[PDB]
Amino acid sequence: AQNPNCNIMIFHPTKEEFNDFDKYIAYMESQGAHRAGLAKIIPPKEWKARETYDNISEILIATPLQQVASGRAGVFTQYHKKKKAMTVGEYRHLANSKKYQTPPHQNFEDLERKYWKNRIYNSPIYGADISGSLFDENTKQWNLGHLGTIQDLLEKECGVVIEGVNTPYLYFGMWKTTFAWHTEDMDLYSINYLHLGEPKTWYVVPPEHGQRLERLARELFPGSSRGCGAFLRHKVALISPTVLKENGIPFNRITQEAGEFMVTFPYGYHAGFNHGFNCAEAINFATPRWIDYGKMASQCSCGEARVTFSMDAFVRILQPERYDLWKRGQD
Ligand SMILES: O=C(O)CNC(=O)C(=O)O
Ligand SMILES: [Mg+2]
Ligand code: NI
Ligand SMILES: [Zn+2]
């Protein structure tokens, strides 16, 4: 078995190897990459997502989110308070302000220490889930707005034709902006490209150990657990590496820098934070190996997680029994 310790793998495709997306994903899995839950892909040196970022300030963040924390430094929840709309230009200025900017630090490790020590005492502002793309239409390789769609994968593998579309989303982050512990909708893959700015640190639990994380989460957030049988789908809970180590949960960490892709694999729980002002683009995708994870994916039926038009069809076809009760939570 390849990659038996479930380490995060880093790949350096040639421009020749960067032409066929599906084939490269299947290559990485041949080498065991999926066992970690997360992989890094460094694009060929000749490749570019676009010519420059010089004119992005006019993108609108219609609902910036202030991420308010509650709990203790290593075990907290976050709630997203909606703020007034601002442009990317206004957001970048805010991120660079004395109140919100990255503090002085020695290296990524000192900064990680400062994040876990101090996150709860601040409320950084996140521009999340903004439909759109920053890839130039002329970028033919690994363009997240030109991937084959999950609906087309389900059609090719299973023969069924369903409604829905699959498009990317932009994320604008600042120091301390945080993504809570989660897997993707329907335990899909994701791919995330860091277009510009400061790094993003990731934590990930191997898929084969995801239930260990869930059992810890039920112990640490007991009333959330009683309220919903899949409350990590609400994307509100954080658990530090120190706490994970104290409770024997297998995990890994890695820092993504500007110009790099990350792939998350089905049922790979992940969480993380941003080091300073940045812009990432991400989209879900599927492969044939995903289908069985889609069938087995947990769902939020308490009604908090409240998910897409396109996820409806996935639930209807892959989880017909749940269909019913799940759409009661989503209506
Ligand atoms: O970048 C972020 O804020 C969150 N991204 C992801 O969870 C992802 O790409 O799966
Ligand atoms: Mg613009
Ligand atoms: Ni994710
Ligand atoms: Zn729920």
Side-chain angles (χ1 to χ4, degrees), residues 1-47 49-50 52-81 83-214 216-244 246-305 307-327 329-330:
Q2 292 266 235
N3 192 21
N5 282 358
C6 302
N7 292 313
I8 298 168
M9 300 177 70
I10 304 165
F11 296 85
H12 288 89
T14 61
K15 58 183 185 356
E16 294 78 23
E17 287 173 326
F18 218 52
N19 277 304
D20 186 333
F21 186 87
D22 293 341
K23 179 176 178 181
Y24 200 81
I25 299 299
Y27 171 68
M28 293 161 58
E29 295 192 351
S30 79
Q31 306 303 293
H34 59 295
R35 300 189 64 178
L38 184 68
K40 176 176 290 192
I41 306 93
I42 294 166
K45 69 189 176 296
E46 303 87 359
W47 180 94
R50 68 183 296 110
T52 83
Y53 293 83
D54 271 340
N55 297 96
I56 70 166
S57 312
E58 315 316 312
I59 292 165
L60 193 68
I61 309 174
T63 311
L65 304 176
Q66 179 172 55
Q67 299 189 295
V68 178
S70 301
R72 60 186 175 96
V75 182
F76 63 90
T77 60
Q78 50 186 16
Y79 105 78
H80 291 159
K81 179 175 181 159
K83 309 297 279 185
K84 289 188 167 182
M86 77 179 83
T87 65
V88 170
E90 290 169 329
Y91 183 89
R92 183 176 58 219
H93 193 251
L94 184 65
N96 289 339
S97 65
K98 292 185 183 171
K99 171 169 181 58
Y100 292 97
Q101 72 184 218
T102 317
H105 61 279
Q106 296 291 339
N107 54 39
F108 292 165
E109 188 169 352
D110 185 35
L111 194 64
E112 181 186 36
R113 185 191 60 77
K114 291 178 191 289
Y115 173 84
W116 293 104
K117 185 184 161 46
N118 300 317
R119 160 69 184 87
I120 65 171
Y121 305 110
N122 295 86
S123 305
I125 293 170
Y126 211 165
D129 299 307
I130 297 158
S131 293
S133 186
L134 288 170
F135 287 86
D136 190 317
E137 64 177 8
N138 295 323
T139 296
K140 302 310 177 183
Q141 299 172 326
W142 288 57
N143 178 324
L144 299 189
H146 295 172
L147 304 183
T149 68
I150 299 157
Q151 298 77 15
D152 284 342
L153 181 288
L154 195 142
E155 185 180 328
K156 296 179 292 194
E157 293 300 298
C158 303
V160 77
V161 178
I162 51 173
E163 72 287 359
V165 295
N166 181 199
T167 51
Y169 295 88
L170 305 175
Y171 301 82
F172 291 94
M174 66 169 58
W175 168 234
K176 285 174 178 167
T177 53
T178 301
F179 52 109
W181 282 108
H182 72 282
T183 64
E184 306 303 306
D185 290 341
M186 219 71 181
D187 296 344
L188 284 156
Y189 300 65
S190 63
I191 182 167
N192 181 302
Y193 179 70
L194 192 51
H195 281 281
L196 63 93
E198 305 308 317
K200 190 187 296 284
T201 292
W202 298 71
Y203 305 95
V204 61
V205 173
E208 69 199 67
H209 305 303
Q211 294 88 358
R212 301 188 186 214
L213 181 68
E214 298 170 350
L216 178 61
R218 294 194 300 270
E219 290 162 12
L220 295 175
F221 301 98
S224 294
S225 183
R226 290 186 288 272
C228 179
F231 75 96
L232 299 173
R233 304 260 175 223
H234 311 168
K235 308 200 293 194
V236 301
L238 280 300
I239 306 163
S240 74
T242 295
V243 176
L244 291 180
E246 289 173 342
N247 290 275
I249 308 303
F251 75 95
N252 284 296
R253 79 192 88 188
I254 193 167
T255 301
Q256 174 191 25
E257 302 187 67
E260 306 180 335
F261 289 92
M262 312 293 297
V263 165
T264 83
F265 296 83
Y267 195 64
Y269 276 104
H270 56 281
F273 65 91
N274 294 301
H275 292 207
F277 173 72
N278 64 19
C279 171
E281 180 168 342
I283 198 178
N284 295 120
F285 73 95
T287 70
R289 195 174 66 81
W290 165 72
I291 295 277
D292 284 338
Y293 288 85
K295 298 179 186 158
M296 296 168 330
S298 68
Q299 308 296 347
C300 169
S301 317
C302 87
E304 284 292 301
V307 306
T308 180
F309 183 93
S310 310
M311 217 198 114
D312 188 278
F314 306 154
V315 179
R316 189 170 78 249
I317 299 304
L318 297 181
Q319 305 183 314
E321 187 230 22
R322 286 187 175 156
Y323 192 64
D324 291 26
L325 176 74
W326 167 89
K327 194 169 44 59
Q330 244 352 337

